[PDB]
Amino acid sequence: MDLQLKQAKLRLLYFNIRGRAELIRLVLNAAEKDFEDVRVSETEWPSLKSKMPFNQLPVLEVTTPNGQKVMLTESMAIARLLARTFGLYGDNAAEVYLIERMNSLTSSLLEEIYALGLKKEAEHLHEYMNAIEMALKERKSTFIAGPRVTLADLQVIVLIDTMNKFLPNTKHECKDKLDEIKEGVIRTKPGVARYLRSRPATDF
Amino acid sequence: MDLQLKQAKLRLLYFNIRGRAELIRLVLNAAEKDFEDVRVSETEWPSLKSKMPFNQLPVLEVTTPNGQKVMLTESMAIARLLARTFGLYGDNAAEVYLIERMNSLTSSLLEEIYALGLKKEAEHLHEYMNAIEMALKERKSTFIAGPRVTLADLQVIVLIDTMNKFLPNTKHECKDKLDEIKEGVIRTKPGVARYLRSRPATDF
Numbered sequence: 326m327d328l329q330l331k332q333a334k335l336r337l338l339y340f341n342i343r344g345r346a347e348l349i350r351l352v353l354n355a356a357e358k359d360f361e362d363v364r365v366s367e368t369e370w371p372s373l374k375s376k377m378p379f380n381q382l383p384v385l386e387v388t389t390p391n392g393q394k395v396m397l398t399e400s401m402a403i404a405r406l407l408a409r410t411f412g413l414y415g416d417n418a419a420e421v422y423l424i425e426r427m428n429s430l431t432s433s434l435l436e437e438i439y440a441l442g443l444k445k446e447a448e449h450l451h452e453y454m455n456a457i458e459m460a461l462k463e464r465k466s467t468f469i470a471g472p473r474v475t476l477a478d479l480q481v482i483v484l485i486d487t488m489n490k491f492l493p494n495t496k497h498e499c500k501d502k503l504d505e506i507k508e509g510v511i512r513t514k515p516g517v518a519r520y521l522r523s524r525p526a527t528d529f
Numbered sequence: 530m531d532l533q534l535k536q537a538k539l540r541l542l543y544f545n546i547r548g549r550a551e552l553i554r555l556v557l558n559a560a561e562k563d564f565e566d567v568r569v570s571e572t573e574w575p576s577l578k579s580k581m582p583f584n585q586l587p588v589l590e591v592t593t594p595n596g597q598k599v600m601l602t603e604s605m606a607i608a609r610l611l612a613r614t615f616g617l618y619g620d621n622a623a624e625v626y627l628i629e630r631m632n633s634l635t636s637s638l639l640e641e642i643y644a645l646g647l648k649k650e651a652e653h654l655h656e657y658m659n660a661i662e663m664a665l666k667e668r669k670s671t672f673i674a675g676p677r678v679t680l681a682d683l684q685v686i687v688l689i690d691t692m693n694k695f696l697p698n699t700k701h702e703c704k705d706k707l708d709e710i711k712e713g714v715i716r717t718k719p720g721v722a723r724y725l726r727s728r729p730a731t732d733f
Contacts, residue, residue, distance in 0.1 A: 326623045326624075327621070327623050328623065380656060380660075381656075397626070397630075398630065398660075399629070399630045399633035399634065400633075401629070401633060402626055402629035402630045402632075402633050405625075405626075405629060406622055406625070406626045406629075409622040409625070410622060417531070418610055418613040418614060419530045419531050419532065420530075421609075421610070421613070422601070422606055422609075422610045425603070425605070425606035425609060425610075426601075426602065426603045426606045428606075429603035429604075429605060429606050430603065452584060452585075456584075456602075
Protein backbone atom coordinates (compact mmCIF):
# COMPACT_ATOMS: atom_id res chain seq x y z
CA MET A 326 0.00 0.00 0.00
CA ASP A 327 2.97 2.32 0.69
CA LEU A 328 5.00 2.63 -2.53
CA GLN A 329 8.10 3.98 -0.72
CA LEU A 330 8.29 6.78 -3.27
CA LYS A 331 11.38 8.43 -1.76
CA GLN A 332 13.40 5.36 -2.79
CA ALA A 333 11.26 3.91 -5.59
CA LYS A 334 12.32 4.08 -9.21
CA LEU A 335 10.03 6.49 -11.05
CA ARG A 336 9.30 6.76 -14.77
CA LEU A 337 6.97 9.50 -15.99
CA LEU A 338 5.28 8.80 -19.34
CA TYR A 339 3.79 11.82 -21.12
CA PHE A 340 3.99 13.73 -24.39
CA ASN A 341 6.91 16.01 -25.27
CA ILE A 342 5.14 19.12 -24.02
CA ARG A 343 4.68 20.83 -20.67
CA GLY A 344 0.93 20.22 -20.72
CA ARG A 345 -0.62 18.42 -17.79
CA ALA A 346 2.54 16.59 -16.65
CA GLU A 347 4.70 19.68 -16.09
CA LEU A 348 3.40 19.97 -12.53
CA ILE A 349 4.66 16.44 -11.79
CA ARG A 350 8.06 17.25 -13.31
CA LEU A 351 8.21 20.40 -11.16
CA VAL A 352 7.41 18.52 -7.92
CA LEU A 353 10.09 15.89 -8.57
CA ASN A 354 12.69 18.49 -9.52
CA ALA A 355 11.79 20.62 -6.49
CA ALA A 356 12.33 17.52 -4.31
CA GLU A 357 15.51 16.62 -6.26
CA LYS A 358 14.10 13.14 -6.76
CA ASP A 359 15.45 11.55 -9.93
CA PHE A 360 13.05 10.08 -12.47
CA GLU A 361 13.04 9.00 -16.08
CA ASP A 362 11.23 11.78 -17.97
CA VAL A 363 9.90 9.69 -20.89
CA ARG A 364 8.48 11.89 -23.64
CA VAL A 365 6.19 10.00 -26.03
CA SER A 366 5.31 11.10 -29.54
CA GLU A 367 1.84 10.63 -30.97
CA THR A 368 3.57 8.38 -33.52
CA GLU A 369 4.54 6.07 -30.65
CA TRP A 370 1.33 6.40 -28.61
CA PRO A 371 -0.85 3.82 -30.46
CA SER A 372 1.63 0.98 -29.87
CA LEU A 373 2.31 2.05 -26.28
CA LYS A 374 -1.41 2.31 -25.52
CA SER A 375 -1.92 -1.26 -26.78
CA LYS A 376 0.65 -3.06 -24.62
CA MET A 377 0.19 -1.09 -21.39
CA PRO A 378 -2.81 -1.24 -19.02
CA PHE A 379 -3.78 2.44 -19.44
CA ASN A 380 -5.60 4.58 -22.00
CA GLN A 381 -4.34 8.11 -21.23
CA LEU A 382 -1.17 9.90 -20.18
CA PRO A 383 0.48 10.93 -17.89
CA VAL A 384 1.25 7.69 -16.09
CA LEU A 385 3.81 7.40 -13.31
CA GLU A 386 5.35 3.93 -13.41
CA VAL A 387 6.66 3.18 -9.91
CA THR A 388 9.03 0.31 -9.15
CA THR A 389 9.08 0.02 -5.38
CA PRO A 390 12.35 -0.83 -3.56
CA ASN A 391 11.03 -4.40 -3.29
CA GLY A 392 10.63 -4.63 -7.07
CA GLN A 393 6.88 -4.18 -7.44
CA LYS A 394 5.74 -2.32 -10.56
CA VAL A 395 2.67 -0.10 -10.08
CA MET A 396 1.19 2.25 -12.72
CA LEU A 397 -0.31 5.40 -11.23
CA THR A 398 -2.81 7.48 -13.16
CA GLU A 399 -4.67 10.81 -12.85
CA SER A 400 -2.26 13.74 -13.18
CA MET A 401 -3.36 15.80 -10.17
CA ALA A 402 -3.69 12.76 -7.89
CA ILE A 403 -0.11 11.85 -8.83
CA ALA A 404 1.12 15.40 -8.24
CA ARG A 405 -0.52 15.64 -4.79
CA LEU A 406 0.80 12.22 -3.75
CA LEU A 407 4.33 13.25 -4.74
CA ALA A 408 3.94 16.63 -3.05
CA ARG A 409 2.84 14.96 0.20
CA THR A 410 5.75 12.53 0.01
CA PHE A 411 8.34 15.29 -0.37
CA GLY A 412 6.98 17.87 2.07
CA LEU A 413 5.43 20.14 -0.59
CA TYR A 414 1.81 19.91 0.61
CA GLY A 415 1.67 21.91 3.85
CA ASP A 416 1.41 20.81 7.46
CA ASN A 417 -2.29 21.01 8.37
CA ALA A 418 -5.73 21.10 6.80
CA ALA A 419 -5.96 24.90 6.95
CA GLU A 420 -2.77 25.29 4.91
CA VAL A 421 -4.03 22.60 2.54
CA TYR A 422 -7.24 24.57 2.02
CA LEU A 423 -5.11 27.49 0.81
CA ILE A 424 -3.23 25.15 -1.55
CA GLU A 425 -6.40 23.58 -2.91
CA ARG A 426 -8.37 26.80 -3.25
CA MET A 427 -5.59 28.26 -5.36
CA ASN A 428 -5.11 25.06 -7.34
CA SER A 429 -8.83 24.99 -8.09
CA LEU A 430 -8.60 28.49 -9.56
CA THR A 431 -5.38 27.91 -11.50
CA SER A 432 -6.40 24.45 -12.77
CA SER A 433 -9.71 25.86 -14.00
CA LEU A 434 -7.98 28.82 -15.66
CA LEU A 435 -5.45 26.47 -17.30
CA GLU A 436 -8.19 24.27 -18.75
CA GLU A 437 -10.08 27.35 -20.02
CA ILE A 438 -6.92 28.68 -21.71
CA TYR A 439 -6.21 25.27 -23.27
CA ALA A 440 -9.75 25.09 -24.67
CA LEU A 441 -9.56 28.53 -26.33
CA GLY A 442 -6.37 27.93 -28.32
CA LEU A 443 -8.08 26.49 -31.40
CA LYS A 444 -11.83 26.69 -30.64
CA LYS A 445 -11.99 30.07 -32.39
CA GLU A 446 -14.06 34.70 -23.21
CA ALA A 447 -11.85 37.39 -21.67
CA GLU A 448 -14.76 37.70 -19.20
CA HIS A 449 -14.58 34.14 -17.88
CA LEU A 450 -10.79 34.38 -18.07
CA HIS A 451 -10.86 37.75 -16.25
CA GLU A 452 -12.96 36.24 -13.46
CA TYR A 453 -10.30 33.62 -12.65
CA MET A 454 -7.46 36.11 -13.07
CA ASN A 455 -9.11 38.56 -10.69
CA ALA A 456 -9.73 35.84 -8.08
CA ILE A 457 -6.11 34.67 -8.32
CA GLU A 458 -4.74 38.21 -8.16
CA MET A 459 -6.97 38.92 -5.17
CA ALA A 460 -5.79 35.87 -3.21
CA LEU A 461 -2.18 36.70 -4.02
CA LYS A 462 -2.54 40.28 -2.77
CA GLU A 463 -4.40 39.26 0.41
CA ARG A 464 -1.98 36.55 1.55
CA LYS A 465 -0.01 37.04 4.76
CA SER A 466 2.95 34.86 3.74
CA THR A 467 5.68 34.70 1.13
CA PHE A 468 4.09 31.77 -0.72
CA ILE A 469 0.48 30.88 -1.40
CA ALA A 470 -0.09 28.66 1.64
CA GLY A 471 2.58 29.81 4.04
CA PRO A 472 6.26 30.68 4.32
CA ARG A 473 7.43 27.77 2.14
CA VAL A 474 6.73 26.56 -1.40
CA THR A 475 3.94 24.06 -1.91
CA LEU A 476 2.23 22.45 -4.90
CA ALA A 477 0.18 25.62 -5.45
CA ASP A 478 3.30 27.73 -6.07
CA LEU A 479 4.53 25.11 -8.53
CA GLN A 480 1.27 25.17 -10.48
CA VAL A 481 1.60 28.96 -10.68
CA ILE A 482 4.70 28.27 -12.81
CA VAL A 483 2.63 26.06 -15.13
CA LEU A 484 0.05 28.85 -15.39
CA ILE A 485 2.65 31.55 -16.20
CA ASP A 486 4.19 29.50 -19.00
CA THR A 487 0.75 28.78 -20.42
CA MET A 488 -0.28 32.46 -20.38
CA ASN A 489 3.03 33.36 -22.07
CA LYS A 490 2.32 30.94 -24.93
CA PHE A 491 -1.46 31.33 -25.29
CA LEU A 492 -1.89 34.98 -24.15
CA PRO A 493 1.45 36.73 -24.75
CA ASN A 494 0.14 40.30 -24.97
CA THR A 495 -2.59 40.05 -22.31
CA LYS A 496 -1.77 42.73 -19.73
CA HIS A 497 -3.47 41.80 -16.45
CA GLU A 498 -2.06 42.69 -13.04
CA CYS A 499 -2.31 39.02 -12.04
CA LYS A 500 0.64 38.23 -14.32
CA ASP A 501 3.00 40.27 -12.13
CA LYS A 502 1.73 38.68 -8.91
CA LEU A 503 2.17 35.21 -10.45
CA ASP A 504 5.69 36.08 -11.60
CA GLU A 505 6.57 37.10 -8.04
CA ILE A 506 5.64 33.61 -6.83
CA LYS A 507 7.71 32.05 -9.62
CA GLU A 508 10.70 34.21 -8.64
CA GLY A 509 10.44 32.89 -5.08
CA VAL A 510 10.18 29.27 -6.19
CA ILE A 511 13.34 29.71 -8.27
CA ARG A 512 15.13 31.32 -5.34
CA THR A 513 14.11 28.72 -2.74
CA LYS A 514 13.98 25.51 -4.84
CA PRO A 515 17.31 25.23 -6.66
CA GLY A 516 16.10 21.99 -8.25
CA VAL A 517 13.30 23.91 -9.95
CA ALA A 518 15.64 26.72 -11.02
CA ARG A 519 17.99 24.23 -12.68
CA TYR A 520 15.15 22.27 -14.27
CA LEU A 521 13.53 25.37 -15.81
CA ARG A 522 16.90 26.36 -17.25
CA SER A 523 17.61 22.88 -18.70
CA ARG A 524 14.20 21.51 -19.73
CA PRO A 525 13.36 21.19 -23.45
CA ALA A 526 11.97 24.37 -24.98
CA THR A 527 8.55 23.25 -26.24
CA ASP A 528 5.59 25.11 -27.70
CA PHE A 529 2.97 23.66 -25.35
CA MET B 530 -5.86 30.04 10.52
CA ASP B 531 -7.77 27.13 12.11
CA LEU B 532 -11.50 27.78 11.65
CA GLN B 533 -12.52 25.25 14.36
CA LEU B 534 -15.01 23.75 11.93
CA LYS B 535 -16.28 21.08 14.34
CA GLN B 536 -17.80 23.86 16.48
CA ALA B 537 -18.12 26.69 13.95
CA LYS B 538 -21.48 27.81 12.62
CA LEU B 539 -21.74 26.83 8.96
CA ARG B 540 -23.99 28.24 6.24
CA LEU B 541 -23.84 26.71 2.76
CA LEU B 542 -25.01 29.02 -0.05
CA TYR B 543 -25.87 27.31 -3.34
CA PHE B 544 -28.72 26.90 -5.81
CA ASN B 545 -31.73 24.66 -5.11
CA ILE B 546 -30.23 21.70 -6.95
CA ARG B 547 -27.83 18.90 -6.10
CA GLY B 548 -25.25 20.17 -8.60
CA ARG B 549 -21.76 20.89 -7.35
CA ALA B 550 -22.70 21.47 -3.68
CA GLU B 551 -24.31 18.07 -3.06
CA LEU B 552 -20.93 16.61 -2.13
CA ILE B 553 -20.58 19.23 0.63
CA ARG B 554 -24.08 18.48 1.91
CA LEU B 555 -23.22 14.77 1.94
CA VAL B 556 -19.99 15.29 3.94
CA LEU B 557 -21.75 17.40 6.58
CA ASN B 558 -24.66 14.97 6.88
CA ALA B 559 -22.27 12.01 7.06
CA ALA B 560 -20.47 13.80 9.92
CA GLU B 561 -23.82 14.80 11.50
CA LYS B 562 -22.59 18.38 11.61
CA ASP B 563 -25.48 20.83 11.46
CA PHE B 564 -25.45 23.63 8.89
CA GLU B 565 -27.84 26.06 7.30
CA ASP B 566 -28.53 24.68 3.81
CA VAL B 567 -29.37 27.98 2.07
CA ARG B 568 -30.82 27.39 -1.39
CA VAL B 569 -30.67 30.48 -3.62
CA SER B 570 -32.83 31.08 -6.67
CA GLU B 571 -31.47 32.74 -9.78
CA THR B 572 -34.04 35.46 -9.06
CA GLU B 573 -32.18 36.18 -5.81
CA TRP B 574 -28.63 35.66 -7.12
CA PRO B 575 -28.03 39.13 -8.68
CA SER B 576 -28.72 40.96 -5.42
CA LEU B 577 -26.78 38.43 -3.34
CA LYS B 578 -23.80 38.59 -5.72
CA SER B 579 -23.71 42.38 -5.34
CA LYS B 580 -23.52 42.64 -1.54
CA MET B 581 -21.24 39.65 -0.87
CA PRO B 582 -17.51 39.38 -1.66
CA PHE B 583 -17.86 36.45 -4.08
CA ASN B 584 -18.90 35.91 -7.69
CA GLN B 585 -19.84 32.20 -7.79
CA LEU B 586 -21.53 29.59 -5.63
CA PRO B 587 -21.17 27.42 -3.57
CA VAL B 588 -19.77 29.45 -0.70
CA LEU B 589 -19.40 28.09 2.83
CA GLU B 590 -19.85 30.96 5.29
CA VAL B 591 -18.05 29.96 8.50
CA THR B 592 -18.54 31.77 11.81
CA THR B 593 -15.78 30.50 14.07
CA PRO B 594 -16.49 29.91 17.80
CA ASN B 595 -14.75 33.24 18.44
CA GLY B 596 -17.17 35.05 16.12
CA GLN B 597 -15.02 35.51 13.03
CA LYS B 598 -16.88 35.32 9.70
CA VAL B 599 -14.90 33.72 6.85
CA MET B 600 -16.27 32.96 3.35
CA LEU B 601 -14.79 29.82 1.83
CA THR B 602 -14.91 29.21 -1.91
CA GLU B 603 -14.08 26.46 -4.43
CA SER B 604 -16.46 23.52 -4.05
CA MET B 605 -13.95 20.66 -4.00
CA ALA B 606 -11.51 22.51 -1.73
CA ILE B 607 -14.40 23.04 0.70
CA ALA B 608 -15.45 19.39 0.48
CA ARG B 609 -11.92 18.09 1.13
CA LEU B 610 -11.40 20.47 4.05
CA LEU B 611 -14.65 19.30 5.63
CA ALA B 612 -13.81 15.66 4.93
CA ARG B 613 -10.42 16.04 6.63
CA THR B 614 -12.03 17.74 9.61
CA PHE B 615 -14.54 14.95 10.15
CA GLY B 616 -12.36 11.91 9.49
CA LEU B 617 -13.68 11.25 5.96
CA TYR B 618 -10.36 11.65 4.10
CA GLY B 619 -8.31 8.57 5.01
CA ASP B 620 -5.31 8.14 7.28
CA ASN B 621 -2.23 8.29 5.03
CA ALA B 622 -1.09 9.48 1.63
CA ALA B 623 -1.55 6.07 0.01
CA GLU B 624 -5.22 5.95 1.02
CA VAL B 625 -5.59 9.55 -0.13
CA TYR B 626 -4.20 8.60 -3.54
CA LEU B 627 -7.04 6.08 -3.86
CA ILE B 628 -9.56 8.78 -2.87
CA GLU B 629 -8.14 11.33 -5.29
CA ARG B 630 -7.67 8.95 -8.21
CA MET B 631 -11.32 7.98 -7.97
CA ASN B 632 -12.48 11.55 -7.43
CA SER B 633 -10.53 12.63 -10.51
CA LEU B 634 -12.40 10.04 -12.58
CA THR B 635 -15.84 10.74 -11.11
CA SER B 636 -15.43 14.54 -11.16
CA SER B 637 -14.39 14.40 -14.81
CA LEU B 638 -17.28 12.10 -15.69
CA LEU B 639 -19.71 14.39 -13.83
CA GLU B 640 -18.53 17.47 -15.73
CA GLU B 641 -18.78 15.58 -19.05
CA ILE B 642 -22.33 14.48 -18.25
CA TYR B 643 -23.30 18.03 -17.23
CA ALA B 644 -21.93 19.42 -20.50
CA LEU B 645 -23.90 16.98 -22.68
CA GLY B 646 -27.34 17.73 -21.25
CA LEU B 647 -28.16 20.59 -23.62
CA LYS B 648 -25.16 20.80 -25.99
CA LYS B 649 -26.96 18.52 -28.45
CA GLU B 650 -19.81 11.04 -26.70
CA ALA B 651 -20.67 7.59 -25.32
CA GLU B 652 -17.01 6.86 -26.17
CA HIS B 653 -15.51 9.48 -23.86
CA LEU B 654 -18.21 8.63 -21.32
CA HIS B 655 -17.48 4.90 -21.72
CA GLU B 656 -13.78 5.50 -21.06
CA TYR B 657 -14.47 7.02 -17.63
CA MET B 658 -17.13 4.43 -16.82
CA ASN B 659 -14.78 1.58 -17.67
CA ALA B 660 -11.97 3.08 -15.56
CA ILE B 661 -14.32 3.54 -12.60
CA GLU B 662 -15.78 0.06 -12.96
CA MET B 663 -12.27 -1.38 -13.19
CA ALA B 664 -11.07 0.34 -10.00
CA LEU B 665 -14.21 -0.75 -8.17
CA LYS B 666 -13.74 -4.39 -9.18
CA GLU B 667 -10.01 -4.43 -8.34
CA ARG B 668 -10.29 -2.92 -4.86
CA LYS B 669 -9.37 -5.02 -1.83
CA SER B 670 -11.66 -3.22 0.62
CA THR B 671 -15.33 -2.53 1.20
CA PHE B 672 -15.07 1.14 0.20
CA ILE B 673 -12.99 2.89 -2.42
CA ALA B 674 -10.00 3.75 -0.24
CA GLY B 675 -10.26 1.25 2.57
CA PRO B 676 -12.66 -0.33 5.04
CA ARG B 677 -14.47 2.93 5.84
CA VAL B 678 -16.33 5.59 3.84
CA THR B 679 -14.38 8.55 2.55
CA LEU B 680 -15.11 11.52 0.30
CA ALA B 681 -14.73 9.30 -2.78
CA ASP B 682 -17.65 7.07 -1.73
CA LEU B 683 -19.76 10.19 -1.15
CA GLN B 684 -19.01 11.53 -4.62
CA VAL B 685 -20.09 8.16 -6.04
CA ILE B 686 -23.55 9.06 -4.71
CA VAL B 687 -23.44 12.36 -6.60
CA LEU B 688 -22.44 10.45 -9.75
CA ILE B 689 -25.26 7.88 -9.41
CA ASP B 690 -27.93 10.56 -9.03
CA THR B 691 -26.52 12.42 -12.03
CA MET B 692 -26.51 9.31 -14.24
CA ASN B 693 -30.10 8.57 -13.16
CA LYS B 694 -31.24 12.03 -14.29
CA PHE B 695 -29.06 12.54 -17.38
CA LEU B 696 -28.63 8.89 -18.53
CA PRO B 697 -31.62 6.94 -17.17
CA ASN B 698 -31.58 4.08 -19.68
CA THR B 699 -27.79 3.74 -20.06
CA LYS B 700 -26.97 0.14 -19.12
CA HIS B 701 -23.30 -0.04 -18.13
CA GLU B 702 -21.93 -2.49 -15.56
CA CYS B 703 -20.36 0.44 -13.70
CA LYS B 704 -23.82 1.52 -12.52
CA ASP B 705 -24.19 -1.64 -10.42
CA LYS B 706 -20.72 -1.28 -8.89
CA LEU B 707 -21.47 2.36 -8.03
CA ASP B 708 -24.81 1.40 -6.48
CA GLU B 709 -23.00 -1.13 -4.26
CA ILE B 710 -20.86 1.68 -2.84
CA LYS B 711 -23.96 3.81 -2.27
CA GLU B 712 -25.64 0.93 -0.44
CA GLY B 713 -22.66 0.71 1.90
CA VAL B 714 -22.60 4.45 2.56
CA ILE B 715 -26.29 4.31 3.50
CA ARG B 716 -25.66 1.34 5.78
CA THR B 717 -22.62 2.81 7.55
CA LYS B 718 -23.45 6.56 7.58
CA PRO B 719 -26.92 6.92 9.08
CA GLY B 720 -26.66 10.68 8.64
CA VAL B 721 -26.39 10.18 4.88
CA ALA B 722 -29.24 7.66 4.84
CA ARG B 723 -31.54 10.12 6.61
CA TYR B 724 -30.43 13.05 4.46
CA LEU B 725 -31.05 11.21 1.18
CA ARG B 726 -34.52 10.28 2.41
CA SER B 727 -35.38 13.84 3.51
CA ARG B 728 -33.60 16.13 1.03
CA PRO B 729 -35.67 18.08 -1.53
CA ALA B 730 -36.45 16.11 -4.68
CA THR B 731 -34.88 18.26 -7.40
CA ASP B 732 -34.32 17.75 -11.11
CA PHE B 733 -30.60 18.58 -11.10
